[PDB]
Design a protein around this ligand. Structure first.
Ligand SMILES: CC(=O)N[C@H]1[C@H]([C@H](O)[C@H](O)CO)O[C@@](O)(C(=O)O)C[C@@H]1O
Ligand SMILES: CC(=O)N[C@H]1[C@H]([C@H](O)[C@H](O)CO)O[C@@](O)(C(=O)O)C[C@@H]1O
Ligand SMILES: [Ca+2]
Ligand SMILES: [Ca+2]
Ligand SMILES: [Ca+2]
Ligand SMILES: [Ca+2]
Ligand SMILES: [Ca+2]
Ligand SMILES: [Ca+2]
Ligand SMILES: [Ca+2]
Ligand SMILES: [Ca+2]
Ligand SMILES: [Ca+2]
Ligand SMILES: [Cl-]
Ligand SMILES: [Cl-]
Ligand SMILES: [Cl-]
Ligand SMILES: [Cl-]
Ligand SMILES: [Cl-]
Ligand SMILES: [Cl-]
Ligand SMILES: [Cl-]
Ligand SMILES: [Cl-]
Ligand code: NA
Ligand code: NA
Lengths: 56, 264, 281, 234, 48, 56, 281, 48, 56, 27
């Protein structure tokens, strides 16, 4: 049950096998590049178009 | 008809001819070019002055004598006061440039001597006090078109404040390496019996795409007499060496008010 | 791929003259033996494997020796012996430095290895329990310790390695961390432009790479509290560049270094030993 | 756990080892590469570049720019112009060339050596010069009539300014050692006037040539070692 | 046993290491997740 | 994700698996025999043919 | 493959005479039992596995014993005890040497293993922290140490192994490193030709392999600084030839060695014990 | 790490062992072989 | 890149993987039963048939 | 996934005014 994944590039793959029956034992979660800044930077009810006036 | 000895170079409104060349060097085999989008860094639309600045500028001439130990310049420092190139350089935080370097020295079929002409990336030179290390003033590091000269003696200063200049010791190339190995750098030789000019075309060389020209010289230009000037009718004769350099593929970013460096 | 084999050739009587050239052009001599002698065929199976950059640099080299101690310190000077800080560099030693300085620019990952040794300071003060060391990498900006047991050693974000005396030499890899697209081994410039009529000092400013380089600090302590027996330790730091690229070759250092710059020393600028005569075999 | 058994070597730190190790800065985003001119891949590329031999490193000229130019004149002496042993790592004059410096990081070398000479007299000076390489085991040549029995080239001075003499790889062993060593001695390089240098009036009667050395494409080195050319106090 | 040989680094504690380790509470049933508003994935979201 | 490669010959293959998620952790780069001495030994604009005169 | 089986044969009365030969030819006797007796069939399943060259040489053999110490040295002689250098050879001991010298030439890789032991010099000077050793291979030409803590030990290019006392015996492989196409165990010659009327000394020159061999130097130190207690150490060096080829067999050494050459000693050239009579069972 | 357990024999140096070990001179280019007369493969050849 | 080979019999296979990039690092060469005693025991120019006279 | 690349743009003379906003909105 080996997982082969891309490495973070340096100056290209690596292999992982989980040895333990509890997921808590696992190494770090894989890089998660998810983001949605707008839930904090623009949490407005009505859409604001940049090129338009903010208030009309 | 065409010959390795005869060349014309035109950049902008300026043209050079030579009838006793010896081919031309393209440093590291790479012609200069503009900065590609896939290697770019500052994001403002750059200024590309083209013909206003990418043209031959002729420096003050120096005199080769039987006793001369050699000459050095830095680039873009040597051209900092040259027409529109200088203006574009100082109005911007960032700049990059390649160069055509044309070194000129004619004599006669009865003179002899040989000049090594070297283009050296990051030409860092030793300071002239042993009370400190890396202790050189901005003003002494950046002489402009007058450049500097080598010496065959090393006489470091008694006090640190008096030694804030380069110890341009010829046989150590002013930097603790043997001058005989300078040929690992892009070079030509002006050997008076063979040729009267050297031509080196230099790409931009740095560990960055673009950098602060007023802080950082990318190239040194070194002219060393490898074999001394001799002329039998007058051993004290002098012949001029003239250096003419054109920026190429110049590109500037970060426009603001003009930079005026300290002069003392 | 192998180094060049030699072809079978005889003699010539020809207007082709490969023995002559003109090095004024900037080209080195190019002629090979087959151009100027009669040669047999020799198949060359030998390779340049050991002179690739990876092979040339593929060694862990000692770059510094640090010292730390563990004892009951009652003075400021002795308190400062309980930990040490070192600005990370390759200029404390000469061998790796000189090899790197065949080049103007480089790009590599780093393997760092450490050798840690101890001795008893004295024999009339009992013994000491086995010591654990902390080696903390402090990137530029992170707070530096002022005591061996201050808050900085909790190291929530800085990488630290805890090493137990007698265990295998500790080791970690560091990526290429340069803020430029390559490391510069030489920098012909300054960190700022001094401007006309400014009041900033221009008499005590420096030049070159020393004005712009900062790879952070290594801080080392013995984690244990003091025993009656004072223990003194040395930490040797080793660097191996790996996954190496280099650009723009340079003549190698010909005379002794005298610091972090390219400066040379007046009593040590005569590397050649004079020969008796130009005709000395 | 998986049953295992430690072998000799366990826990040692061999400085030429080649193992993986944990990264102190995980998921670090390296600066993107850009093209930089002048990339080098092999130290032998650098060994193929000509560098000047300090051929005239005699008392008063050693450690000055005057150590490089080889004195010539129009007198046509039978004495050799220069003489040097083919010991490119250890010879007092070859050791500090670029090739010599690279060789002193290695224990073994093999291949052909290229010696290129640049005449720097006036255009009006003519001459013929004999350049010779004599493989070892016989009386070192001190006269032209002995030198010309070895590998040699007769150089006619003229429009083409430079002449290349080869020391072809001629050795008993497959590699020579990068030290002074009788067993791996390389032989003798010498130089004589073939005719003489001739000049007309109003022309310098003494002048110089420059000698360069580089490795040929058949050249390689082995067995990395520390150099004796750099050190520090302790 | 399988013949093995320890390398440099053996037994060190690097605080930025990323290894597996045995669980002190095996077969523990974690509280089921529920959706909570305002999840953050990257510190750069906060920087914006 | 095992890589099998040729060994350097002695007086013939070996196996490598990467264990770490960062390429910086990897062992030495594989032998790279690339070279182009001419960028240093002959960086001239106009081609020079050995058998021809260097200057014509 | 097995050693020879014996075929079923009876007797003969024949002009075929395999019992007679003529060893003047340079051929050894060739006859086997079936040629001169009545034989049964015997199937031979036995093999010559343990007398292949790899099997014969497949042992780590001690080739030398080195000594190093760690204490506060105040004289030149005592400073020289803080490290040791040894020209690499197999002639310090006799057993592996004699086995190799069944052959004129060989080609092999080498496994080198080391056994490192310590004792206290005295009991009235306290104790000593666990010691780390550096074993540095110095190829011919590389600078040799003159002190235990000089610059050479930074070992940027020379291979070094750092060994921690009490750990498994350290070990590394060395390729076939000969500058010829095989190693020579014997060399009937000199390093240079002495020429007519030369002034070079001919009275104190040597002969054979000693004039041409050089496998470099092993340098060993204790990396630790001194404790109050002086510690003395021995380093035993072991060699195992592996991946072995050999050529041109020789009679084995019959009398004691007296040095690196083939020379023998006047009081030790009578290996045979005389028998009472030619008819002694 | 992979859970492992050391067995008897661990760390011993048996002089007739047959293990791999790291090379002190990596990527070293050995001198090419040539044919030499008189190659021997087995000590029993000499016994005959 | 595992090699499976026959073991030397005792009172039947084993597995080898090479871990290092240099062949010098490898374990012992496999048993080589090659032999040609005649190059030492009978290095004669003209064939000698045992049953025949050595000299005729 | 990468951080944002910068597009090639010139100037404008327009009723589109992205430089102005109203942070009273909470944006
Ligand atoms: C570093 C050093 O030199 N330590 C030495 C000490 C100290 O000099 C004194 O104990 C300090 O007063 O003295 C010894 O005689 C001891 O204690 O056994 C030997 C020991 O090596
Ligand atoms: C190598 C050796 O023989 N060491 C012995 C020493 C030294 O002879 C003296 O200490 C030197 O003065 O003496 C002992 O009695 C001791 O110190 O306990 C026993 C010890 O074995
Ligand atoms: Ca808006
Ligand atoms: Ca423009
Ligand atoms: Ca030919
Ligand atoms: Ca402490
Ligand atoms: Ca294990
Ligand atoms: Ca030509
Ligand atoms: Ca029978
Ligand atoms: Ca010591
Ligand atoms: Ca017969
Ligand atoms: Cl100016
Ligand atoms: Cl803490
Ligand atoms: Cl504690
Ligand atoms: Cl001399
Ligand atoms: Cl002198
Ligand atoms: Cl050290
Ligand atoms: Cl210590
Ligand atoms: Cl008897
Ligand atoms: Na080939
Ligand atoms: Na059988």
């Amino acid at each position: 049950g080996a997982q082969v994944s891309s490495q973070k590039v340096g100056a290209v793959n690596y292999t992982t096998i989980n040895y333990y029956k509890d997921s808590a034992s696992n190494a770090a979660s894989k890089l998660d590049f998810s983001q949605d800044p707008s839930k904090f930077t623009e949490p407005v009810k009505d859409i604001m178009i940049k090129t338009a006036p903010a208030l009309n | 008809g065409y010959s390795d000895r005869v060349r014309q170079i035109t950049l902008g409104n300026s043209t050079i001819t030579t009838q006793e060349a010896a081919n031309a060097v393209v440093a590291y085999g790479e012609w200069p070019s503009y900065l590609d989008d896939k290697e770019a860094n500052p994001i403002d639309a750059p200024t590309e002055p083209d013909v206003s600045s990418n043209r031959f500028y002729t420096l003050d001439s120096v005199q080769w004598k039987s006793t001369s130990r050699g000459w050095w310049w830095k680039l873009p420092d040597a051209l900092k006061d040259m027409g529109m190139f200088g203006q574009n350089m100082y109005y911007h935080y960032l700049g990059r440039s390649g160069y055509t370097v044309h070194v000129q020295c004619n004599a006669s079929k009865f003179h002899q001597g040989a000049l090594g002409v070297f283009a050296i990336p990051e030409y860092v030179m030793a300071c002239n006090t042993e009370a400190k290390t890396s202790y050189v003033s901005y003003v002494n590091a950046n002489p402009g078109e007058k450049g500097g000269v080598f010496d065959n003696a090393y006489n470091p200063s008694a006090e640190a404040s008096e030694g804030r200049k380069f110890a341009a010791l010829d046989y150590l190339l002013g930097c603790g390496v043997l001058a005989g190995n300078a040929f690992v750098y892009p070079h030509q030789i002006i050997n008076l019996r063979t040729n009267n000019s050297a031509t080196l075309v230099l790409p931009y060389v740095n560990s960055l795409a673009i950098d602060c020209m007023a802080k950082h010289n990318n190239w040194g230009l070194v002219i060393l007499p490898l074999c001394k000037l001799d002329y039998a009718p007058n051993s004290s004769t002098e012949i001029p060496i003239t250096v003419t350099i054109a920026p190429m593929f110049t590109e500037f970013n970060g426009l603001r008010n003009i930079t005026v460096p300290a002069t003392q | 791929p192998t180094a060049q084999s030699t072809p079978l050739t005889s003699g010539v009587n020809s207007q082709e003259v490969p023995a002559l050239t003109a090095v004024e052009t900037g080209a080195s001599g190019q002629a090979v033996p087959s151009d100027v002698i009669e040669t047999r065929h020799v198949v060359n199976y030998k390779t340049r494997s050991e002179s690739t950059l990876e092979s040339f640099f593929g060694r862990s080299a000692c770059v510094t020796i640090l010292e730390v101690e563990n004892f009951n310190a009652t003075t400021d000077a002795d308190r400062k012996k309980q930990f040490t800080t070192w600005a990370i560099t390759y200029t404390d030693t000469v061998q790796l430095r000189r090899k790197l300085e065949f080049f103007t620019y480089s790009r590599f990952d780093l393997e760092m290895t450490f050798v840690i040794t101890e001795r008893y300071y004295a024999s009339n003060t009992g013994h000491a329990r086995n010591q654990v060391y902390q080696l903390m990498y402090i990137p530029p900006g992170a707070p530096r310790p002022t005591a061996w047991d201050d808050y900085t050693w909790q190291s929530s974000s800085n990488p630290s390695v805890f090493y137990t005396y007698g265990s295998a030499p500790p080791r970690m890899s560091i990526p290429y961390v340069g803020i430029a697209n390559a490391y510069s081994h030489f920098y012909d410039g300054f960190a700022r432009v001094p401007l006309k009529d400014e009041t900033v000092d221009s008499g005590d400013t420096y030049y070159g790479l020393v004005t712009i380089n900062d790879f952070g600090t290594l801080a080392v302590r013995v984690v244990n509290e003091y025993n009656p027996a004072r223990i003194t330790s040395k930490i040797r730091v080793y660097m191996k560049p790996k996954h190496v690229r280099c650009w723009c070759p340079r003549p190698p250092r010909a005379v002794p270094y005298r610091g972090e710059g390219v400066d040379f020393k007046q009593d040590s600028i005569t590397p050649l030993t004079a020969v008796e005569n130009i005709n000395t075999f | 756990g998986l049953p295992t058994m430690l072998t000799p070597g366990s826990s040692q730190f061999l400085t030429s080892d080649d193992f993986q190790s944990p990264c102190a800065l995980p998921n670090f985003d390296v600066t993107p590469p850009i093209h930089i001119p002048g990339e080098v891949f092999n130290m032998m590329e650098l060994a193929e570049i000509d560098s000047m031999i300090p051929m005239n490193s005699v008392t008063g000229k050693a450690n000055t720019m005057e150590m490089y130019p080889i004195p010539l004149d129009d007198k046509g002496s039978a004495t050799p112009i220069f003489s040097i042993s083919l010991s490119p790592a250890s010879d007092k004059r070859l050791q500090y060339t670029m090739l010599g410096e690279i060789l002193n990081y290695y224990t073994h070398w093999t291949g052909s050596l290229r010696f290129t000479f640049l005449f720097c007299g006036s255009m009006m000076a003519t001459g013929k010069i004999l350049l010779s390489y004599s493989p070892p085991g016989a009386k070192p040549p001190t006269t032209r009539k002995d030198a010309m029995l070895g590998t040699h080239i007769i150089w006619d001075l003229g429009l083409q300014s430079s002449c290349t003499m080869l020391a072809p790889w001629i050795s008993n062993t497959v590699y020579r050692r990068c030290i002074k060593d009788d067993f791996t001695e390389g032989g003798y390089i010498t130089c004589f006037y073939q005719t003489r240098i001739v000049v007309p009036s109003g022309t310098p009667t003494s002048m110089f040539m420059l000698a360069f050395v580089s490795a040929c494409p058949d050249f390689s080195v082995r067995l990395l070692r520390d150099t004796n050319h750099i050190s520090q106090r302790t």
